[PDB]
């Protein structure tokens, strides 16, 4: 792409500089260039790729929700007609967000997932695939919506099945996967009971394994466990 001429190491070094400068669109472009070099990603590199895109897409999602709320209000009885501009601009933001999701899903399909053999890489990428189909599902209203939801479910389920077999119940990737799959159940699949059961069981199985951990691993795991508790508190 436009990053075709830059060394892989220089793309990684610039992604880290962009992160320090809070320039997340640049960070994501540098990391997309690094992926497109064709080599597998190390754990540090996979987390640079995730950090970059989650911040880009998170700006688009928060903007989309502001716009959608405005558009819904314009559709209430007694609202003055203001023309097509709110729908057009929500659509503009929606299309760009879909495009970011398609770009991430494209990197995973070409060819991050197929070369990822170890559990920590394979589960991380499948969680990513679930997360970006979930962001597509958040905006979907069409004939497509069930299949987008199903794609998110299927990716999360394959990541859950590997993580349960190959990772300890305290592993931060296994914990974050379960936190996000639980959010998928609650907010996307209309299954709040499955969301609460998943968050509860995940929290309790990690609590029972904390004893095996070093002080630093303990802090990594308990951080994610508190997110699961925050959602159980919100939902119960």
């Amino acid at each position: 792409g436009a990053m075709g001429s830059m060394e892989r190491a220089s793309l990684i070094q610039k992604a880290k500089l962009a992160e320090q400068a809070e320039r997340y669109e640049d960070m994501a472009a540098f990391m997309k260039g690094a992926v497109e070099k064709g080599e597998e990603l190390s754990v540090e590199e996979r987390n640079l790729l995730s950090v970059a895109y989650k911040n880009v897409v998170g700006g688009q999602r928060a903007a989309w929700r502001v716009l959608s709320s405005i558009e819904q209000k314009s559709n209430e009885e007694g609202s003055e007609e203001k023309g097509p501009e709110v729908r057009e601009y929500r659509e503009k933001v929606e299309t760009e967000l879909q495009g970011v999701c398609d770009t991430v899903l494209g990197l995973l399909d070409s060819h991050l997932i197929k070369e990822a053999g170890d559990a920590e890489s394979r589960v991380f990428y499948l969680k990513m695939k679930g997360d970006y189909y979930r962001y597509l599902a958040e905006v979907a209203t069409g004939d497509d919506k069930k299949r987008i939801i199903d794609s998110a479910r299927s990716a999360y389920q394959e990541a859950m099945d590997i993580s349960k077999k190959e990772m300890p119940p305290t592993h931060p990737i296994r914990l974050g996967l379960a936190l996000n799959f639980s959010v998928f159940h609650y907010e996307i699949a209309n299954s709040p009971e499955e969301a609460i059961s998943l968050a509860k069981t995940t929290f309790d199985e990690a609590m029972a394994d904390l004893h095996t951990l070093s002080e630093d691993s303990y802090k990594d795991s308990t951080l994610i466990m508190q997110l699961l508790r925050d959602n159980l508190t919100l939902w119960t």
């Binding site: 974050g176 936190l179 996000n180 609650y186 997110l227 925050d230 959602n231």
Partner: peptide, 6 residues
């Protein structure tokens, strides 16, 4: 106030 994801 918003549910957590990571």
């Amino acid at each position: 106030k918003r549910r957590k994801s990571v």
